[PDB]
Design a protein around this nucleic acid. Structure first.
Ligand SMILES: [Mg+2]
Ligand SMILES: [Mg+2]
Ligand SMILES: [Mg+2]
Ligand SMILES: [Mg+2]
Ligand SMILES: [Mg+2]
Ligand SMILES: [Mg+2]
Ligand SMILES: [Mg+2]
Ligand SMILES: [Mg+2]
Ligand SMILES: [Mg+2]
Ligand SMILES: [Mg+2]
Ligand SMILES: [Mg+2]
Ligand SMILES: [Mg+2]
Ligand SMILES: [Mg+2]
Ligand SMILES: [Mg+2]
Ligand SMILES: [Mg+2]
Lengths: 73, 119, 101, 88
RNA sequence: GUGGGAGAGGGUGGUGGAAUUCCCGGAGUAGCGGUGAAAUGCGCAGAUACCGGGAGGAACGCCGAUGGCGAAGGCAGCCACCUGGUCCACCCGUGACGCUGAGGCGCGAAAGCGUGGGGAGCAAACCGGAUUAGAUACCCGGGUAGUCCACGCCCUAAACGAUGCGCGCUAGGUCUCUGGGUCUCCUGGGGGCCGAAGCUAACGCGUUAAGCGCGCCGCCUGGGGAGUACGGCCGCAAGGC
């Protein structure tokens, strides 16, 4: 699946290296802590890469989860 | 005897059997059922049917304490899971919701041969 | 010296006093290591994606003290000695790799 | 690490003439620096095998230049040494 | 040299959360477990399932690739420090300072060894259940060495691209990682696939050659006996060359 819209379009000029930008980062995670793929985020290796290094900080810090519970079903 | 009215229902499905549990809000169980409980004992404990019977028993007995609204939580991927869930729903118990909380390590202990093989 | 961003998350249950106390060390101990606080931006209370120290929230800080590399795994080794301090994050500063601009 | 200064400082110390970056001395000297450093790092991190091979090459590259110096102009050679800290 | 870039390349210290096991408390009751079926096993000294707390060991989900780094073995939570290699642009410096490399020296997965420590999960041996004509096995329940750390050994492998290193030459297409540009595309470095000429027993290789050439090293000479015997060298030993 995933032919909707990339998580990059729905957003603007933003430091992909800012580990505090919760409001934006939260956009790169599934219904779980899971870090969205590229087919999803629609980023470049260099980018997608950095994103993660950043996300993984949001985590230790406490701003971002490691995993979420799946509602619905 | 206690009169809970609103609690949660934990469903633990496994390839081998399904045990269902109904606790109260804070988390403490009230009553529980299982393939064994309902009577099946052996290879049958796993079959969805059993799960249906089990889940419904978890309810009946739950109904006693005055339960009415559970927040079904699933764990495991065993056979007869999305099955037990369908029971609690059609049990009268207003199923507030459903959630999948099957635990999963971020690479913890080496599984046993039975489930080994990395990729 | 190098530019390091410092993040600090301490117990979100202090009164003006109890708190201004911690920051006395966060500043004292800090200067004792060649602090040089290029800046600061106290964000305060935060709703943590997950409880930390069994606390549903946290009080966040953030600096930019430029200091002597040799004395960093130390500076932090020092900030950790605190009790009401539950997180010490010391990242090295980095240009803003802007994305989608 | 070795600072831009640290480096330049050593270059403008051996260079045959203002503008000499790649002369056979500058190089040796320069190396000797990079070497004498890592030789320290490894004095500690004995387990750091990979870095070592890095040094096992600088030393080579170093003696190889010298071997060439001692050939062309045995004078400058006898010089670079006394100036640095080799042959002893 | 200068200015830039990428990276699970290495070493040391710290530190994050998920999971299993164990302990403590709550609540709760007759089973859980496991299999093709079962049994052994565990549970009313209260197990399983659920909630809270604690201790500890090991490994790091998603990102993750059909990706990257490394000479090879190999390398992925996050942070800092210490450190190696390498690529691009500038054309700035030296002026053949080059290639290869017997022997030497160093590194070298796993298993294994020595001393000390650690020991959650896993598990040779082993102890049991089951299956079977038998079962010294595949399946199940346990479990020691080990797996982990340090220090010292050991030196093997389908240690594989089964393809030694270096340099030049010889159509293209396409996908991709990383740098530069006047950024449709051109240009450099690396990873793939299809392919000219050509090569090849065939399969296949084909600017990442197995093509056309030069240099240096290693190696082969029918199968079995045999990677054995003898000798030597190495190792604490197993055992290695
Ligand atoms: Mg020139
Ligand atoms: Mg000249
Ligand atoms: Mg020679
Ligand atoms: Mg070894
Ligand atoms: Mg080993
Ligand atoms: Mg041992
Ligand atoms: Mg076991
Ligand atoms: Mg076994
Ligand atoms: Mg190419
Ligand atoms: Mg290319
Ligand atoms: Mg042809
Ligand atoms: Mg081909
Ligand atoms: Mg023969
Ligand atoms: Mg042999
Ligand atoms: Mg001997």
């Amino acid at each position: 699946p995933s032919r909707k819209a990339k998580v990059k379009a729905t957003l603007g000029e933003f430091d992909l290296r800012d580990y505090r930008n919760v409001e934006v980062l939260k956009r790169f995670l599934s219904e779980t802590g899971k870090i969205l793929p590229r087919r999803r985020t629609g980023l470049s290796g260099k980018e997608q890469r950095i994103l993660a290094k950043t996300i993984k900080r949001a985590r230790i810090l406490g701003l971002l989860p490691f995993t979420e519970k799946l509602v619905r079903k | 005897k206690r009169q809970v009215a609103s609690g949660r229902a934990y469903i633990h499905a496994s390839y081998n059997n399904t045990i269902v549990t109904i606790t109260d809000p804070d988390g403490n169980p009230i009553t529980w059922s299982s393939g064994g409980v309902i009577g099946y004992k052996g290879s049958r404990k796993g079959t969805p049917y059993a799960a249906q019977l089990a889940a419904l028993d978890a309810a009946k007995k739950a109904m006693a304490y005055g339960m009415q609204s559970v927040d079904v939580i699933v764990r495991g991927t065993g056979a007869g899971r999305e099955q037990a869930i369908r029971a609690l729903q059609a049990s009268g118990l207003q199923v507030k919701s459903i959630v999948d909380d099957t635990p999963v390590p971020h690479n913890g202990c080496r599984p046993k041969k039975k489930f080994r093989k990395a990729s | 010296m190098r530019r390091y961003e410092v993040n600090i998350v301490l117990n979100p249950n202090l009164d003006q006093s109890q708190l201004a106390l911690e920051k006395e060390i966060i500043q004292r101990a800090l200067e004792n290591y060649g602090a040089r606080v290029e800046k600061v931006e106290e964000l305060g209370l935060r709703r943590l994606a997950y409880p930390i120290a069994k606390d549903p929230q946290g009080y966040f800080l953030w600096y930019q003290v430029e200091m002597p590399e040799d004395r960093v795994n130390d500076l932090a080794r020092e900030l950790r000695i605190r009790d009401n301090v539950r997180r010490v994050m010391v990242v090295k500063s980095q240009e803003p790799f802007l994305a989608n601009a | 690490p070795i600072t831009k200064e640290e480096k330049q400082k050593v270059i403008q110390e051996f260079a045959r003439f203002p503008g000499d970056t790649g002369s056979t001395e500058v190089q040796v000297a320069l190396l000797t620096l990079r070497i004498n450093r890592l030789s320290e790092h490894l004095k500690v991190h004995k387990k750091d095998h990979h870095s070592h091979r890095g040094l096992l090459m600088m030393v080579g590259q170093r003696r190889r230049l010298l071997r060439y110096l001692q050939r062309e102009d045995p004078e400058r050679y006898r010089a670079l040494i006394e100036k640095l800290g080799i042959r002893g």
